[PDB]
Amino acid sequence: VHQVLYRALVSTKWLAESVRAGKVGPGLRVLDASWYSPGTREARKEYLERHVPGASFFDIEECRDKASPYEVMLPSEAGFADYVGSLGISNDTHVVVYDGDDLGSFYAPRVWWMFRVFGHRTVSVLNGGFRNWLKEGHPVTSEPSRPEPAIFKATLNRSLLKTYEQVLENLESKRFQLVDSRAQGRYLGTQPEPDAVGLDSGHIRGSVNMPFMNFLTEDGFEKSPEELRAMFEAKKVDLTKPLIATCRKGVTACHIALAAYLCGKPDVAIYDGSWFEWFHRAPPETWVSQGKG
């Protein structure tokens, strides 16, 4: 955040040099923010076995509001602060975050946004992610990162977050553009929602769809600012106006926030409850589906 936009992307070369030169410690912390659907890869375990040297695992299963019925919702300020402090991250630390997902980035934008929605601007995603760190032959360890605990002060930057109530008031004001980053079929209600029973697919009326995978090249890299800009413009998303991103559970919505951030817009808000919460709370009239339910 801050219009002195802190660099949101860091390359594999850059991070390999900093690892190699002994720079990760209290000034630079690196997080594996991997998570995968129940049944596929075991994120946590996969980290214990291979990670960039000095990287800690950031567990999204843990650093979330566990009491909520909805999926991966923000913790409290204090809950985030405690978690992140134990990983040796202070308010002065530059946090770099990657995940090991196959198109280079899935969950790392969510953690980049979590740090920012708690007022920490000095965070960046590893461009190419762990997939390209591996492909380039940079070092990995199984040895445990045991950082000193640090004090982190979290302050919820509420302009970067939307609640159910605000997205529902926006249906009568259109003061914010609403973009959904799910795959087109899920957005249209013709393909089902994964890892749920009884949850229909569809989208909030007035949402525009920008499938998050299209911000990445097949190699796993973020597309250039030049291409990202053109994508918003083809969808007629005006980057000088308020924009709210949403998806299924507020995770890939952060890719729209990252994409816009590389285009110079630092304040895309994420509707954290997203489709899962919306479907369970919203008046059924507020959403459409081509299955029609």
Side-chain angles (χ1 to χ4, degrees), residues 237-253:
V237 179
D238 184 355
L239 288 163
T240 63
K241 276 185 174 171
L243 200 174
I244 298 169
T246 186
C247 59
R248 161 58 185 267
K249 53 178 86 168
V251 176
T252 67

mmCIF file with all atom_site columns, all heavy atoms in Angstrom, residues 237-253:
data_model
loop_
_atom_site.group_PDB
_atom_site.id
_atom_site.type_symbol
_atom_site.label_atom_id
_atom_site.label_alt_id
_atom_site.label_comp_id
_atom_site.label_asym_id
_atom_site.label_entity_id
_atom_site.label_seq_id
_atom_site.pdbx_PDB_ins_code
_atom_site.Cartn_x
_atom_site.Cartn_y
_atom_site.Cartn_z
_atom_site.occupancy
_atom_site.B_iso_or_equiv
_atom_site.pdbx_formal_charge
_atom_site.auth_seq_id
_atom_site.auth_comp_id
_atom_site.auth_asym_id
_atom_site.auth_atom_id
_atom_site.pdbx_PDB_model_num
ATOM 1   N N   . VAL A 1 237 ? -12.854 -2.865  -16.931 1.00 0.00 ? 237 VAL A N   1
ATOM 2   C CA  . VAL A 1 237 ? -12.660 -2.591  -15.520 1.00 0.00 ? 237 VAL A CA  1
ATOM 3   C C   . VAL A 1 237 ? -11.742 -1.374  -15.459 1.00 0.00 ? 237 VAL A C   1
ATOM 4   O O   . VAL A 1 237 ? -10.618 -1.325  -15.968 1.00 0.00 ? 237 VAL A O   1
ATOM 5   C CB  . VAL A 1 237 ? -12.028 -3.817  -14.827 1.00 0.00 ? 237 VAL A CB  1
ATOM 6   C CG1 . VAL A 1 237 ? -11.802 -3.503  -13.370 1.00 0.00 ? 237 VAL A CG1 1
ATOM 7   C CG2 . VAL A 1 237 ? -12.954 -5.025  -14.926 1.00 0.00 ? 237 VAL A CG2 1
ATOM 8   N N   . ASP A 1 238 ? -12.357 -0.365  -14.862 1.00 0.00 ? 238 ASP A N   1
ATOM 9   C CA  . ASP A 1 238 ? -11.764 0.938   -14.705 1.00 0.00 ? 238 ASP A CA  1
ATOM 10  C C   . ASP A 1 238 ? -10.955 0.931   -13.417 1.00 0.00 ? 238 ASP A C   1
ATOM 11  O O   . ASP A 1 238 ? -11.455 0.899   -12.286 1.00 0.00 ? 238 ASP A O   1
ATOM 12  C CB  . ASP A 1 238 ? -12.904 1.991   -14.679 1.00 0.00 ? 238 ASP A CB  1
ATOM 13  C CG  . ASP A 1 238 ? -12.521 3.476   -14.625 1.00 0.00 ? 238 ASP A CG  1
ATOM 14  O OD1 . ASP A 1 238 ? -11.339 3.806   -14.501 1.00 0.00 ? 238 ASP A OD1 1
ATOM 15  O OD2 . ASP A 1 238 ? -13.418 4.316   -14.709 1.00 0.00 ? 238 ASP A OD2 1
ATOM 16  N N   . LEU A 1 239 ? -9.649  0.985   -13.646 1.00 0.00 ? 239 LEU A N   1
ATOM 17  C CA  . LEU A 1 239 ? -8.693  0.993   -12.549 1.00 0.00 ? 239 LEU A CA  1
ATOM 18  C C   . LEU A 1 239 ? -8.532  2.321   -11.827 1.00 0.00 ? 239 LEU A C   1
ATOM 19  O O   . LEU A 1 239 ? -7.636  2.431   -11.004 1.00 0.00 ? 239 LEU A O   1
ATOM 20  C CB  . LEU A 1 239 ? -7.355  0.545   -13.076 1.00 0.00 ? 239 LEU A CB  1
ATOM 21  C CG  . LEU A 1 239 ? -7.182  -0.915  -13.424 1.00 0.00 ? 239 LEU A CG  1
ATOM 22  C CD1 . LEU A 1 239 ? -5.952  -1.055  -14.301 1.00 0.00 ? 239 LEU A CD1 1
ATOM 23  C CD2 . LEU A 1 239 ? -7.101  -1.741  -12.149 1.00 0.00 ? 239 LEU A CD2 1
ATOM 24  N N   . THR A 1 240 ? -9.311  3.373   -12.116 1.00 0.00 ? 240 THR A N   1
ATOM 25  C CA  . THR A 1 240 ? -9.264  4.590   -11.312 1.00 0.00 ? 240 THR A CA  1
ATOM 26  C C   . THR A 1 240 ? -10.465 4.630   -10.387 1.00 0.00 ? 240 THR A C   1
ATOM 27  O O   . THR A 1 240 ? -10.665 5.549   -9.601  1.00 0.00 ? 240 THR A O   1
ATOM 28  C CB  . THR A 1 240 ? -9.287  5.874   -12.173 1.00 0.00 ? 240 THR A CB  1
ATOM 29  O OG1 . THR A 1 240 ? -10.508 5.950   -12.906 1.00 0.00 ? 240 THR A OG1 1
ATOM 30  C CG2 . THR A 1 240 ? -8.106  5.880   -13.106 1.00 0.00 ? 240 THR A CG2 1
ATOM 31  N N   . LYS A 1 241 ? -11.324 3.628   -10.481 1.00 0.00 ? 241 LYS A N   1
ATOM 32  C CA  . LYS A 1 241 ? -12.513 3.582   -9.665  1.00 0.00 ? 241 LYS A CA  1
ATOM 33  C C   . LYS A 1 241 ? -12.378 2.466   -8.651  1.00 0.00 ? 241 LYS A C   1
ATOM 34  O O   . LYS A 1 241 ? -11.583 1.546   -8.882  1.00 0.00 ? 241 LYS A O   1
ATOM 35  C CB  . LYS A 1 241 ? -13.701 3.365   -10.574 1.00 0.00 ? 241 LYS A CB  1
ATOM 36  C CG  . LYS A 1 241 ? -14.176 4.687   -11.136 1.00 0.00 ? 241 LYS A CG  1
ATOM 37  C CD  . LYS A 1 241 ? -15.420 4.328   -11.893 1.00 0.00 ? 241 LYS A CD  1
ATOM 38  C CE  . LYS A 1 241 ? -16.153 5.536   -12.430 1.00 0.00 ? 241 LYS A CE  1
ATOM 39  N NZ  . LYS A 1 241 ? -17.194 5.032   -13.315 1.00 0.00 ? 241 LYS A NZ  1
ATOM 40  N N   . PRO A 1 242 ? -13.134 2.510   -7.532  1.00 0.00 ? 242 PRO A N   1
ATOM 41  C CA  . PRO A 1 242 ? -13.221 1.457   -6.531  1.00 0.00 ? 242 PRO A CA  1
ATOM 42  C C   . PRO A 1 242 ? -13.491 0.092   -7.161  1.00 0.00 ? 242 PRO A C   1
ATOM 43  O O   . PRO A 1 242 ? -14.290 -0.013  -8.092  1.00 0.00 ? 242 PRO A O   1
ATOM 44  C CB  . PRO A 1 242 ? -14.318 1.969   -5.625  1.00 0.00 ? 242 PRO A CB  1
ATOM 45  C CG  . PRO A 1 242 ? -14.234 3.459   -5.667  1.00 0.00 ? 242 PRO A CG  1
ATOM 46  C CD  . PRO A 1 242 ? -14.045 3.607   -7.162  1.00 0.00 ? 242 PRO A CD  1
ATOM 47  N N   . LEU A 1 243 ? -12.748 -0.920  -6.694  1.00 0.00 ? 243 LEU A N   1
ATOM 48  C CA  . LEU A 1 243 ? -12.865 -2.264  -7.205  1.00 0.00 ? 243 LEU A CA  1
ATOM 49  C C   . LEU A 1 243 ? -12.715 -3.186  -6.004  1.00 0.00 ? 243 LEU A C   1
ATOM 50  O O   . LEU A 1 243 ? -11.843 -2.993  -5.164  1.00 0.00 ? 243 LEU A O   1
ATOM 51  C CB  . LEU A 1 243 ? -11.766 -2.478  -8.211  1.00 0.00 ? 243 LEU A CB  1
ATOM 52  C CG  . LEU A 1 243 ? -11.771 -3.553  -9.271  1.00 0.00 ? 243 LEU A CG  1
ATOM 53  C CD1 . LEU A 1 243 ? -10.543 -3.298  -10.150 1.00 0.00 ? 243 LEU A CD1 1
ATOM 54  C CD2 . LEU A 1 243 ? -11.661 -4.939  -8.691  1.00 0.00 ? 243 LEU A CD2 1
ATOM 55  N N   . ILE A 1 244 ? -13.600 -4.185  -5.976  1.00 0.00 ? 244 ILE A N   1
ATOM 56  C CA  . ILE A 1 244 ? -13.710 -5.220  -4.964  1.00 0.00 ? 244 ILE A CA  1
ATOM 57  C C   . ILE A 1 244 ? -13.492 -6.525  -5.721  1.00 0.00 ? 244 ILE A C   1
ATOM 58  O O   . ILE A 1 244 ? -14.080 -6.765  -6.774  1.00 0.00 ? 244 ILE A O   1
ATOM 59  C CB  . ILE A 1 244 ? -15.112 -5.307  -4.327  1.00 0.00 ? 244 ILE A CB  1
ATOM 60  C CG1 . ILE A 1 244 ? -15.495 -4.047  -3.596  1.00 0.00 ? 244 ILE A CG1 1
ATOM 61  C CG2 . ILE A 1 244 ? -15.107 -6.475  -3.355  1.00 0.00 ? 244 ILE A CG2 1
ATOM 62  C CD1 . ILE A 1 244 ? -17.009 -4.031  -3.188  1.00 0.00 ? 244 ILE A CD1 1
ATOM 63  N N   . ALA A 1 245 ? -12.626 -7.380  -5.218  1.00 0.00 ? 245 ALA A N   1
ATOM 64  C CA  . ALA A 1 245 ? -12.435 -8.673  -5.813  1.00 0.00 ? 245 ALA A CA  1
ATOM 65  C C   . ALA A 1 245 ? -13.089 -9.681  -4.887  1.00 0.00 ? 245 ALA A C   1
ATOM 66  O O   . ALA A 1 245 ? -13.153 -9.500  -3.676  1.00 0.00 ? 245 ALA A O   1
ATOM 67  C CB  . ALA A 1 245 ? -10.968 -8.943  -5.932  1.00 0.00 ? 245 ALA A CB  1
ATOM 68  N N   . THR A 1 246 ? -13.602 -10.761 -5.458  1.00 0.00 ? 246 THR A N   1
ATOM 69  C CA  . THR A 1 246 ? -14.261 -11.825 -4.731  1.00 0.00 ? 246 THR A CA  1
ATOM 70  C C   . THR A 1 246 ? -14.030 -13.068 -5.567  1.00 0.00 ? 246 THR A C   1
ATOM 71  O O   . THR A 1 246 ? -13.754 -13.024 -6.777  1.00 0.00 ? 246 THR A O   1
ATOM 72  C CB  . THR A 1 246 ? -15.752 -11.512 -4.616  1.00 0.00 ? 246 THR A CB  1
ATOM 73  O OG1 . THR A 1 246 ? -16.273 -12.534 -3.772  1.00 0.00 ? 246 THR A OG1 1
ATOM 74  C CG2 . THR A 1 246 ? -16.516 -11.512 -5.946  1.00 0.00 ? 246 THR A CG2 1
ATOM 75  N N   . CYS A 1 247 ? -14.127 -14.214 -4.904  1.00 0.00 ? 247 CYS A N   1
ATOM 76  C CA  . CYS A 1 247 ? -14.056 -15.457 -5.634  1.00 0.00 ? 247 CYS A CA  1
ATOM 77  C C   . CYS A 1 247 ? -14.832 -16.467 -4.831  1.00 0.00 ? 247 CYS A C   1
ATOM 78  O O   . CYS A 1 247 ? -15.986 -16.183 -4.521  1.00 0.00 ? 247 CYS A O   1
ATOM 79  C CB  . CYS A 1 247 ? -12.601 -15.857 -5.824  1.00 0.00 ? 247 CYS A CB  1
ATOM 80  S SG  . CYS A 1 247 ? -11.663 -16.067 -4.303  1.00 0.00 ? 247 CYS A SG  1
ATOM 81  N N   . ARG A 1 248 ? -14.283 -17.636 -4.493  1.00 0.00 ? 248 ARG A N   1
ATOM 82  C CA  . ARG A 1 248 ? -14.968 -18.619 -3.688  1.00 0.00 ? 248 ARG A CA  1
ATOM 83  C C   . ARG A 1 248 ? -14.809 -18.390 -2.183  1.00 0.00 ? 248 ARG A C   1
ATOM 84  O O   . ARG A 1 248 ? -15.759 -18.508 -1.404  1.00 0.00 ? 248 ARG A O   1
ATOM 85  C CB  . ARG A 1 248 ? -14.413 -19.970 -4.143  1.00 0.00 ? 248 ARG A CB  1
ATOM 86  C CG  . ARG A 1 248 ? -14.592 -21.161 -3.234  1.00 0.00 ? 248 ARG A CG  1
ATOM 87  C CD  . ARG A 1 248 ? -16.055 -21.450 -2.898  1.00 0.00 ? 248 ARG A CD  1
ATOM 88  N NE  . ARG A 1 248 ? -16.062 -22.530 -1.945  1.00 0.00 ? 248 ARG A NE  1
ATOM 89  C CZ  . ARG A 1 248 ? -16.163 -23.815 -2.306  1.00 0.00 ? 248 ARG A CZ  1
ATOM 90  N NH1 . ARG A 1 248 ? -16.278 -24.176 -3.579  1.00 0.00 ? 248 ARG A NH1 1
ATOM 91  N NH2 . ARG A 1 248 ? -16.062 -24.770 -1.378  1.00 0.00 ? 248 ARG A NH2 1
ATOM 92  N N   . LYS A 1 249 ? -13.592 -18.089 -1.744  1.00 0.00 ? 249 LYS A N   1
ATOM 93  C CA  . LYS A 1 249 ? -13.290 -17.985 -0.324  1.00 0.00 ? 249 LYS A CA  1
ATOM 94  C C   . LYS A 1 249 ? -12.293 -16.874 -0.034  1.00 0.00 ? 249 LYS A C   1
ATOM 95  O O   . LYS A 1 249 ? -11.610 -16.890 0.986   1.00 0.00 ? 249 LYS A O   1
ATOM 96  C CB  . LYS A 1 249 ? -12.765 -19.353 0.161   1.00 0.00 ? 249 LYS A CB  1
ATOM 97  C CG  . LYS A 1 249 ? -11.598 -19.936 -0.622  1.00 0.00 ? 249 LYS A CG  1
ATOM 98  C CD  . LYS A 1 249 ? -11.045 -21.268 -0.133  1.00 0.00 ? 249 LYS A CD  1
ATOM 99  C CE  . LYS A 1 249 ? -11.766 -22.467 -0.673  1.00 0.00 ? 249 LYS A CE  1
ATOM 100 N NZ  . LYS A 1 249 ? -10.980 -23.659 -0.384  1.00 0.00 ? 249 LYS A NZ  1
ATOM 101 N N   . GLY A 1 250 ? -12.192 -15.889 -0.943  1.00 0.00 ? 250 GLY A N   1
ATOM 102 C CA  . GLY A 1 250 ? -11.301 -14.740 -0.793  1.00 0.00 ? 250 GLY A CA  1
ATOM 103 C C   . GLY A 1 250 ? -9.834  -15.006 -1.060  1.00 0.00 ? 250 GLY A C   1
ATOM 104 O O   . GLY A 1 250 ? -8.987  -14.183 -0.689  1.00 0.00 ? 250 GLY A O   1
ATOM 105 N N   . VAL A 1 251 ? -9.518  -16.129 -1.730  1.00 0.00 ? 251 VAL A N   1
ATOM 106 C CA  . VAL A 1 251 ? -8.118  -16.486 -1.985  1.00 0.00 ? 251 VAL A CA  1
ATOM 107 C C   . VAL A 1 251 ? -7.646  -16.067 -3.373  1.00 0.00 ? 251 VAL A C   1
ATOM 108 O O   . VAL A 1 251 ? -6.798  -15.182 -3.454  1.00 0.00 ? 251 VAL A O   1
ATOM 109 C CB  . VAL A 1 251 ? -7.917  -18.020 -1.777  1.00 0.00 ? 251 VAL A CB  1
ATOM 110 C CG1 . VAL A 1 251 ? -6.503  -18.479 -2.124  1.00 0.00 ? 251 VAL A CG1 1
ATOM 111 C CG2 . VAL A 1 251 ? -8.145  -18.324 -0.301  1.00 0.00 ? 251 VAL A CG2 1
ATOM 112 N N   . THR A 1 252 ? -8.160  -16.600 -4.482  1.00 0.00 ? 252 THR A N   1
ATOM 113 C CA  . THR A 1 252 ? -7.725  -16.172 -5.813  1.00 0.00 ? 252 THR A CA  1
ATOM 114 C C   . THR A 1 252 ? -8.183  -14.760 -6.163  1.00 0.00 ? 252 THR A C   1
ATOM 115 O O   . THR A 1 252 ? -7.764  -14.184 -7.168  1.00 0.00 ? 252 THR A O   1
ATOM 116 C CB  . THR A 1 252 ? -8.245  -17.142 -6.878  1.00 0.00 ? 252 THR A CB  1
ATOM 117 O OG1 . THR A 1 252 ? -9.660  -17.023 -6.924  1.00 0.00 ? 252 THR A OG1 1
ATOM 118 C CG2 . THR A 1 252 ? -7.888  -18.573 -6.559  1.00 0.00 ? 252 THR A CG2 1
ATOM 119 N N   . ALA A 1 253 ? -9.058  -14.173 -5.339  1.00 0.00 ? 253 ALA A N   1
ATOM 120 C CA  . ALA A 1 253 ? -9.489  -12.799 -5.531  1.00 0.00 ? 253 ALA A CA  1
ATOM 121 C C   . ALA A 1 253 ? -8.294  -11.872 -5.329  1.00 0.00 ? 253 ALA A C   1
ATOM 122 O O   . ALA A 1 253 ? -8.200  -10.798 -5.927  1.00 0.00 ? 253 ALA A O   1
ATOM 123 C CB  . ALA A 1 253 ? -10.543 -12.459 -4.516  1.00 0.00 ? 253 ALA A CB  1
#
